[PDB]
Every structure is written in structure tokens, then in C-alpha cells.
Structure 1
Amino acid sequence: FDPRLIVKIAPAVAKAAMESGVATRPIADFDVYIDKLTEFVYKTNLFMKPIFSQARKAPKRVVLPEGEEARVLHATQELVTLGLAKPILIGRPNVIEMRIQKLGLQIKAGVDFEIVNNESDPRFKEYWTEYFQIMKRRGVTQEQAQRALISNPTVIGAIMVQRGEADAMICGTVGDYHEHFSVVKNVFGYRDGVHTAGAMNALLLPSGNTFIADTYVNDEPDAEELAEITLMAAETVRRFGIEPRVALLSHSNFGSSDCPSSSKMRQALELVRERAPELMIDGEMHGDAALVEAIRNDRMPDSSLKGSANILVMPNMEAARISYNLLRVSSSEGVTVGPVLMGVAKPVHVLTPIASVRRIVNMVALAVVEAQTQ
């Protein structure tokens, strides 16, 4: 599936046909032919297949709090089959075992996956003591914390990953985003060198692999907070293998409106350019200007952004979720990646309850993959 196939074969075939004397239309723009063939290559990037392969090379421990949920179970089987990770499901062992037989799945407790029982836990005193020492000053009493471990699976899995029992965690298939995130932010803490976190959702457009952030974390991100989001999203996209072409989006077209929200983007731009000059980024611009090069070159030819931009940064959360949701039904394509969490010290990702099992498998892979590096 190497992309350079089209770049090398079709010109060498057309030139050999032009010379062997069978071609009806020689092409004068023989170098532009080369350019067009790269335009296909920027689009349709295949970042998921390698990610899985490195996951197979070093499987890690992954906790899934919603063990009783059916979508979690279908993925645990697919994970054990492909050899990606060792899943630890939290929940009631009896309801999980009964549901597995109802689904027909062949995965079995104690071997394929390890069940942690929220009601009965031998380390139950250690987990609420750990959780209490983290939340004692944040308004969670001891009597609440014990009730917190039995009630919220997400709290249990967080304590495990911090202690070292589990290596990564994926949750959020049941429950609103901010209920899980609050647990994650408090226990794991911000990654060193970072003071704000962000969510990124991936979608496959006619424009190619395209990203949106921040989706579920920050309602009105700060100018400085928008900068830390862009940098991390650029690094994560680089880590997938795609070239980071960033675009700060707004209702204002390159200073057409001087409102506080459009002004916020332009300040963020100057803070990013000093931190990472090598990064390609330009704003603020209309959405269309970020995806269609022809529109951006008419509004400003000197712009450093080249082509369709793969990373899109939204001025506020509302612009993100309204755009991302509408686009998912507008460009029907398979789920590449769910809501990526960035900026947390331990490898964790949180999903929405409308995520497919395939969406779950991918995110668990992305976690194990991130968990190998430390």
C-alpha cells in the first residue's frame, strides 16, 4: 500500500507508451502529471494498519471500565484475536459471563481477560486510600470515596493505572465526557510541560484525512490554551505519519472582523510560531480557505499553508462538536479515530456513547501504542 506507487509507475508507463508509439495524447505538462499523482497521495493516508502492527509487537495492560457493556465485549474478543492487548474488564463478573454466552463469544475469564469486581476487591482499602489522598482537598470525604469506588468504574481504572497495575485505560462508552474526564484530570495529572488538555476527533473527508480540535474539553479555550492544543495535535498527527498542515478557523477571513474570538486566534498564531517555527500553520481563515487551496491563494497567496489542511483548530467547543457531528453524517466514511485525549500524563482516551466497536478497538490500539513509549 505504499503511496509512491502511483508517483513512479504511471509516468514511467506513459513515457514508455509515448515512445513505443501507442499513445494518442502526449502530455506536455509531464511534470504536472507528477504533481497530480501526489495529490492522490496526500489524501487517502493509511495510518491505522501500522499502529496495530506495533501494538502486536508489545501488548500492554488495558482496563475497560464498562465491562458489562456489549460493545466493550465485542472489542475485547477482537482485541484478543488480533493480539493487540490484554484487556481487564471491570464490572459484575456474573453479568459479563452471561452476556458473553448471549453474544456467543469464546473469550473466557482468568485467561483471555481478567475481571475486576467493583463490589468485591481485595485492594479495596488501598484504592480508596489512594483516591482519598488525591481528592481530600477537592471535596471528597472518606465515606464518599469508598462509595465512589463501588459506584464509578472509571474511578477504579484510574487508580490502577497510576499505581502501575494497568498500563492504559479507555472509558466513556457510557456516560457524558466530562464525568470521566474529571476523574482523569485529578488522578493522572497534566503531562509535564503542559497546563491544558484537549480532545481531537478524526474524520475522513474528500479533502483527505482531516482533524478537529478541541471537541469535548474546553468550552471557551484561552489564547494560550489554544496554542498548547495546536502544538500537541501537530505532534500527534506527525506521530501517526501524516504531515501536519494546520489551520486556525474562525468566522473572520484574515482579519475581516476584529471581535475578541477572532483576535484570540491571531495571538495564538504568534505564540505558536515562536515555540515551533517549523510547523506549517496559518489563520485566521474561513473553513473553505483551509480545505481548498484555490480559495486560500485568492485571499492571500503569501500564506504559508499549502493545500488542504489536515488539522483544524476551532475557536470554541461549540464550533467543534457542531462541525464534527454534522461532517460525520456529511462525509460517510469508516471511523478512523475517536475522541483523542491529549495532555494527560498517563495514556488515556475517552469516547462518546455513540462509538462503534471498531471505534473502540482503534482507540485501545492507540493507547497501547502510546503506552509503549514513556
Structure 2
Amino acid sequence: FGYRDGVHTAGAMNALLLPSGNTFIADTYVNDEPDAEELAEITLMAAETVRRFGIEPRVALLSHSNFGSSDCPSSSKMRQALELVRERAPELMIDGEMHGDAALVEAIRNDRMPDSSLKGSANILVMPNMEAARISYNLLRVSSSEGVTVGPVLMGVAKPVHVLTPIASVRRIVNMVALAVVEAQTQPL
């Protein structure tokens, strides 16, 4: 198929149901160590996919650094990705980089950064590498006592296709068939 026009990367995104609501995690399956540009493109595609669900996207970039408390290369990569995203789509609600609890809890974020541009609890989480994304996704999947997901949604390819996992149940297959049909209804971009 190849990439859709205007994009040079692909990503995977998993849905999950936490006490704070529905939440998406990217990227979990494709890129082993994305750079800033790939992170920006993944963020934009994830925002569009979330918009499909009739939800107002809210993005958070996660790291062990908390608003510049560290200067390891990963945190710098997040800062560059954030500036790129703000350059491209100015109307998107996004902030970072921050800790996970700050992203999920309003009071913690407001204590440390009273004037953040992100309101409420984020519903899209972008990780620096596939290690963190996969580990967090699995641990949260088991610990959030439901154990149900909607993933992996694949974004970036020029045709409406998705790739599942061998442990996928019937309901997940039905959900992805419906989602692919919805994507294919409009003329592919």
C-alpha cells in the first residue's frame, strides 16, 4: 500500500478504559525508537482518529522528566516534538512533557504548572519508545480490572487496513471490522 500522502511514518494506538475515562496510548507496535518528527506525525494522526470517535482530543507527552526537570536526550526529543506539533496544528490541545499522574490528574498538574494549556484529564498519551508504551499498556490492561481494549488501530497507511494479535477475541475483531468500514466509507485520504 505505502504511506498516505504527506506522511512518512506509521503508528499503532491502543484504547483502554481507566477510572478517568477512555484513553489512547501510542505508539505501541510499529516504531522502536521514534524521533521528534515521527512523534509529531503520530500525534496528528492519533488526534484525527480520536476525532472519529466523537471525542475532543487532548494530548499529553510523557517522560520521566517533569517540565524540563531533566535534560536526557529523550526529554529534548519530546520538547522538539511539542514545538513541532504546536507549529503545525495550532488549535490542538496539547502540553508536555510531564509525568503520568500530572497528565491524568487535574490537581497535580495545576499545583506544578498553573497555566498549562491542557484542561481536564488527557485522553491521548504519547510515549518516547515502544518499551514504555508496551509495558504501560499491558500492565494497565491487567490492572484496570476489565482487561478489555480496542487495539491496535493502525494509522499512516494509504488504505483502511488493521493488524490484530493472535490473542484477539471475537468482540475485538467485530470492533475493528466496524472501524475499518467507517474509515473506508469516506474517500481514503
Q: With structure 2 as the length reference, what TM-score do the two structures score?
A: 0.97
Partner of 2:109: 296
Partner of 1:348: 161
Q: How big is each residue's C-alpha offset from its partner over 1:322-364, in whole Å with a ceiling of 9 and x where there is no partner?
A: 0000000111236351100000000011112121110111011
Is the contact between residue 141 and residue 149 of structure 2 (CA under 8 Å) also seen in structure 1?
no
Gaps of 5+ in 2: none
What is the alpha-carbon distance in structure 2 between the residues aligned to residue 323 and residue 189 of structure 1? 29
SS of the residue aligned with 1:348?
coil
Pairwise CA RMSD of aligned residues?
0.9
Is the contact between residue 200 and residue 211 of structure 1 (CA under 8 Å) also seen in structure 2?
yes
Q: Which structure has the greater CA radius of gyration?
A: 1
Q: Tell me which protein shows more helix as a share of its residues.
A: 1
Q: How big is each residue's C-alpha offset from its partner over 1:279-305, in whole Å with a ceiling of 9 and x where there is no partner?
A: 000000000000001110111011101
Partner of 2:127: 314
Q: How big is each residue's C-alpha offset from its partner over 1:166-223, in whole Å with a ceiling of 9 and x where there is no partner?
A: xxxxxxxxxxxxxxxxxxxxxx000111100100000000010001000000010011
Is the contact between residue 13 and residue 28 of structure 2 (CA under 8 Å) also seen in structure 1?
yes
Which has the higher relative contact order, 1 or 2, with Cα contacts under 8 A spaced 6 or more apart? 2
Out of 155, 179, 184, the position equivalent to 1:371 is: 184
Is the contact between residue 341 and residue 349 of structure 1 (CA under 8 Å) also seen in structure 2?
yes
Q: With structure 1 as the length reference, what TM-score do the two structures score?
A: 0.49
What is the alpha-carbon distance in structure 1 between the residues aligned to residue 144 and residue 170 of structure 2? 20
**Runs of 4 or more off by more than 2 Å in structure 1?**
332-336
What is the alpha-carbon distance in structure 2 between the residues aligned to residue 323 and residue 357 of structure 1? 24
What is the alpha-carbon distance in structure 1 between the residues aligned to residue 44 and residue 61 of structure 2? 12
Kindly indicate whether residue 85 of structure 2 is the aligned counterpart of residue 272 of structure 1. Answer: yes
Q: 1:208 to 1:296 in 2, by over 3 A?
A: same
What is the alpha-carbon distance in structure 2 between the residues aligned to residue 256 and residue 207 of structure 1? 26
Is the contact between residue 141 and residue 147 of structure 2 (CA under 8 Å) also seen in structure 1?
no
SS of the residue aligned with 2:151?
coil
Is the contact between residue 336 and residue 362 of structure 1 (CA under 8 Å) also seen in structure 2?
no
Out of 47, 56, 61, the position equivalent to 1:243 is: 56
Gaps of 5+ in 1: 1-187
Point out the more displaced range, 351-360 or 309-318. Answer: 351-360
* Identity %, equivalent residues: 100
What is the alpha-carbon distance in structure 2 between the residues aligned to residue 236 and residue 206 of structure 1? 22
Is the contact between residue 202 and residue 337 of structure 1 (CA under 8 Å) also seen in structure 2?
yes
What is the alpha-carbon distance in structure 1 between the residues aligned to residue 103 and residue 167 of structure 2? 28
Q: How big is each residue's C-alpha offset from its partner over 1:13-53, in whole Å with a ceiling of 9 and x where there is no partner?
A: xxxxxxxxxxxxxxxxxxxxxxxxxxxxxxxxxxxxxxxxx
Aligned residue pairs: how many? 187
